[PDB]
Amino acid sequence: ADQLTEEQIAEFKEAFSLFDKDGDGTITTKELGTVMRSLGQNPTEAELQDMINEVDADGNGTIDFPEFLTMMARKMKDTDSEEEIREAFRVFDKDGNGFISAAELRHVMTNLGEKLTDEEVDEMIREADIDGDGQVNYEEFVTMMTSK
Ligand SMILES: [Ca+2]
Ligand SMILES: [Ca+2]
Ligand SMILES: [Ca+2]
Ligand SMILES: [Ca+2]
């Protein structure tokens, strides 16, 4: 739950404003409706309905300021922890071809401080290669390097 300042909470009302088109202080499936549709995204009832269920802590069918601010924040950390392990893959992927070779891990690992034989890097790879392509994708990465 929030600690945040008022500079923090105010960017939050502004936010909570673009959604609350009638200015009543809550957000409806129809107001969510309409926003998803500005931003070129034409959804269906279920999705909307599911998107609200989601944020609707207390189930009156609506979302007030506080339930939004929770989510908004929770999903704030997360957009960060995302990118966090995205910058990471970014150095590890020296060629940023998309996937990380074994030779690249070794380059890094030794670009930093440890000296592995190929064997020991390949052994690194395999453990983290789920699509068994021999390389390491954001996906396998992060399945790994977060967890491990
Ligand atoms: Ca409203
Ligand atoms: Ca609610
Ligand atoms: Ca690469
Ligand atoms: Ca792979």
Curated annotation (Swiss-Prot):
Q: Which residues bind Ca(2+) 1?
A: D20, D22, D24, T26, E31
Q: Where does Ca(2+) 3 bind?
A: D93, D95, N97, E104
Sites where N6,N6,N6-trimethyllysine occurs are at K94
Checking InterPro entries in the record gives: CALM/Myosin/TropC-like (IPR050230), EF-hand-dom_pair (IPR011992), EF_Hand_1_Ca_BS (IPR018247), EF_hand_dom (IPR002048)
Question: Which keywords describe this protein according to UniProt?
Answer: Acetylation, Calcium, Cytoplasm, Metal-binding, Methylation, Repeat
Site feature: Not N6-methylated: K115
The question of whether Acetylation is a record keyword is answered with yes
Q: Which organism is it from?
A: Drosophila melanogaster
Q: Which residues bind Ca(2+) 2?
A: D56, D58, N60, T62, E67
Can you summarize the PTM annotation of this record? Trimethylation of Lys-115 observed in other calmodulins is absent here, but does occur at Lys-94 specifically in the compound eye.
* PROSITE patterns per UniProt: EF_HAND_1, EF_HAND_2
Q: What happens when the gene is disrupted?
A: RNAi-mediated knockdown in the perineurial glia increases ethanol sedation resistance and decreases ethanol tolerance.
Mind telling me which Pfam families this protein's record contains? EF-hand_7
Binding locations of Ca(2+) 4? D129, D131, D133, Q135, E140
UniProt GO BP: actin filament-based movement; autophagic cell death; cellular response to ethanol; centriole replication; detection of chemical stimulus involved in sensory perception of smell; G protein-coupled opsin signaling pathway; kinetochore organization; microtubule cytoskeleton organization
Q: According to its UniProt entry, what is the function of this protein?
A: Calmodulin mediates the control of a large number of enzymes, ion channels and other proteins by Ca(2+). Among the enzymes to be stimulated by the calmodulin-Ca(2+) complex are a number of protein kinases and phosphatases. In photoreceptor cells, light-induced Ca(2+) influx activates calmodulin, which in turn is likely to promote Crag activity in trafficking of newly synthesized ninaE (Rh1) from the trans-Golgi network to rhabdomere membranes. Together with Akap200, regulates PKA activity and ethanol-induced sensitivity and tolerance.
Q: Which residues form the EF-hand domain?
A: 7-42, 43-78, 80-115, 116-148
Domain of life, per lineage: Eukaryota
List the cysteine pairs that form cystine: none
Q: What is this protein called?
A: Calmodulin
Q: What other note does the entry give for this protein?
A: This protein has four functional calcium-binding sites.
